[PDB]
Symmetry: D2
Subunit: 296 residues, 4 copies
């Protein structure tokens, strides 16, 4: 199977005066490329996919594809939906614009059955010829892709090569790789990046890397080289920022941190996302003081 | 405040060959009107709003408006989104197509903070001049509208008159009406329709009423007339069907039941929703046997 | 079946210099009698049963029996254990001292299966000829007595006549009384006393009644007389204190309130229970000011 | 600090005709010793501590102590209680009978606050001069020892040297060792033995080791030597049995398996524990066939 693994970043989407800051966006992707990141995920959860128009999604994927040309960095485009017809369309659309693969979140809100999830992802995978990474985040979607469903999809569909887990469930991570060791388990939870990698996970799709790409990149490559002592050291040092970045719902803290670091001009979200409380603003600013934040 | 209360039905959306069966939709609405229902909710969760196009939503809302003409039955249109710009747009469109009010689900997947939810709903309420009913369903959205946020919205925005609760949390129902007894609490959980009504709730937005509109209508109207003994008797008799209608994710069981009863022509969903398991199909058929299902 | 129902109080156990203050205990029970309580529950959860010696349990049960003599107030003695051999002994012990019935908590910590729960309570019920009330509080025990297990025990064993539910699950309360309407469902959760009673529950075993026995007894008797408007009114008025009494784990707040009210001499617990934080001490004190606390 | 780490077994307690089978108990401990186990835990959760008398607990600790003399194997005696005075007594008794340390479970059922847990464990630790291992299992106790409380006790009390974690929470395991890397984090959850060990955990207190002590011991010692590929390989191979051993509440499956393997004579529990379902009995028997079970 064709795969996209390694250190990867769920890119924030900066807004300026209500619109996508296209210049900032490209500049941020170049900063990730320059700090050892292996792939970028435009228009994921961290990129506020829910509040972007279809045209803004196209724009962000196109900027990511264009910025990564001539480098080793791959573009794993977010292209999920809780409607199978729309998710299939978004997958073909990401391929048509040159994405190397797609990240496709499990359907939110309508809670499909395991059978329904299987048919959902089989339709997506059969619609394109580029790698597809499943994305399990039950706290956001209201549903869980079972281990059996993931493994069935991995074995039945060529393009489906792994899953990005954001479930706080290391037992499930053991279950997955003990029964299907060929899949690419990807950490979707920065605080437990090292435990997932040390169990055989092959990458991360990180929030923290927006702010500290060199550290997340070093962590991942130490771990993939079985330098677990060095990987664990970085994971431990990052625990405090990894947690504070979820003091409020992601991406509210990471965008606050990027703004505090001078990496984006405006602390703008699209409703229903908004600025954090005055405490969490102060707590994020205080935790950042302990880390070396790369500039441009 | 202008309100929409009483016995209400979250209408299923029947499909035939992948298309909305418009004749069937109108005939099912007529059936609801003739069995004492006070309002119909087109394109809610039970109506598979997630997989309908904007034009199909317009279509279902318009059929609901047209079928209720010349009766007392109101149209409380589903018109929510996890993107505030879209939720405001959907509310304005629901008003333009003749809805009497809107039901607006709490943003799913992106988990806004309480501050974000307040701003979300304040934008929606200010966009139209028809009643707005909040909708709290944390098992599906991944977020909760706190009691404090609900009360603030009720008090600060003229159009917001209550909340549909699907949270399995009678403590919260006490909290709401003990601190703001002027709001309209609406049951969004059929099995506990009577406990919510007996605490001062003023209506239901029901799944079971799709199949048993006369029983759900009688229950609600008994409760509103303070005949609690008769309301509880129907609530108790309906428990088995109320629960089996959630053996699988709503609306999979209710559509299965409508098909088994001959009220819809084909057991069709839009992916990622699909037919129930053979075992759950049999269980639904078994529970139905104890109830008298009105025809057309 | 012989039953013990109505408004009941899970009595706090006052300590003085590390021992049970037997006069205070007696003084507290007559105060409950004088304010309309129908039964008292010595040595329950609220009475710190876990840290009392066997002899101490005997003293509190005997004081309860003697103080209630010649009044209509009954003694429903706490007599549970997570070891069946011991639970049987405590039930016999409780009967020998003149208790009218026993409250028997579901086995904590060792998580018996439903089959094990059945055999546990069948052994207890067969050991005495006085009524047995089951007690389901899964947040504390780690196990749940299923509806089916409760109903089977009710139907198979003479002395088992109902269940005290502290599970925040009004759905289960509907489930219980819809399938076995002859059982005595007892609210073990003060905030939702009225919803449980309004569904056919026949009593409460209350924490709040320690402080406000007149209000809890009036609430219960209003509801049993089908004056739901007046029962709901007291339930609504009591919500703030009903919630603050669990700001920390019961009985830490209620004993704090009893001490603040001058109803007990010193705020003493047995470890691992201890005084609340200074912040919750103040919170409790502030909520109490809105209520009229009967004296002795 | 004095520590007890490595591969450890939460010993089952065999019954024959309702009494502790003392000869079987000694023989099972010798089997653990001969298969590379570094310490045995008499009368823990897996040993049915809840239903043993004070006499039987002393008998089991004494058999463990006597059987381990002249070997390197330590005795980490279960000696916890939800009453601090009793937990202090049991700790004192464990030491007097020659235990090398004690395992002390967080108070069950009575739900102490974090302040209360601190005072509870400080009283225990100050009562003896042997190592004390905390034990967090919130699914069974209804309370959680927070990371902050664990670290405070580790730093404030000499003999408190770590925690056995049964919480399904790899995030917390990262939190613990990142802020206090000197403590001994012990896996109390067999399925995730390897992830905990690979993050710096230093031992296991295992259920599966009752049946497969050689495999658990090899896993642990591979991991302590950073032979992670070999440790993970055993962890993966053991996943199926690790999970099936909790098909029903531990120790029902493990005793069933020990009986099925011919390692104990009689499948006897003390109520409220009981035999597993017929179906689970078969599922355990099926899964056992894939593993080589050492004899005596
Ligand atoms: Mg790589
Ligand atoms: Mg599995
Ligand atoms: Mg409140
Ligand atoms: Mg020794
Ligand atoms: Mg070695």
């Amino acid at each position: 199977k064709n795969i996209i693994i390694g250190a990867m970043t769920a890119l924030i989407t900066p807004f300026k005066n209500g619109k996508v800051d296209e210049q900032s966006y490209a500049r941020l992707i170049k900063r990730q490329i320059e700090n050892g990141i292996d792939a970028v995920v435009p228009v994921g959860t961290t990129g506020e996919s829910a509040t972007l128009t279809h045209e803004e999604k196209r724009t962000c994927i196109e900027i990511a594809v264009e910025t990564c040309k001539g480098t080793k960095v791959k573009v794993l485009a977010g292209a999920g939906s809780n409607a199978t017809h729309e998710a299939v369309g978004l997958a073909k659309f990401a391929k048509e614009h040159g994405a190397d693969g797609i990240l496709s979140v499990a359907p939110y809100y309508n809670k499909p059955t395991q059978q329904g999830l299987y048919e959902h992802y089989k339709a997506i995978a059969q619609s394109v010829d580029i790698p597809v990474l499943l994305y399990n985040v039950p706290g956001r979607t209201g549903c869980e892709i079972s281990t059996d469903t993931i493994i069935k999809l991995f074995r039945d569909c060529e393009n489906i090569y792994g899953v990005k887990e954001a479930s706080g469930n290391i037992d499930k991570c053991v279950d997955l790789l003990a029964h299907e060791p060929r899949m690419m388990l990807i950490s979707g939870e920065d605080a437990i990046n090292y435990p997932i990698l040390s169990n055989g996970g092959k990458g991360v799709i990180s929030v923290t890397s927006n702010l500290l790409p060199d550290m997340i990149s070093a962590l991942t490559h130490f771990a993939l080289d079985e330098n677990y002592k060095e990987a664990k050291k970085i994971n431990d040092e990052l625990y405090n920022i990894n947690k504070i970045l979820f003091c409020e719902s992601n991406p509210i803290p990471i965008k606050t941190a990027m703004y505090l670091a001078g990496l984006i001009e405006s602390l703008e979200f699209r409703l229903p996302l908004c600025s954090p409380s005055k405490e969490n603003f102060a707590k994020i600013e205080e935790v950042m003081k302990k880390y070396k934040i790369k500039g441009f």
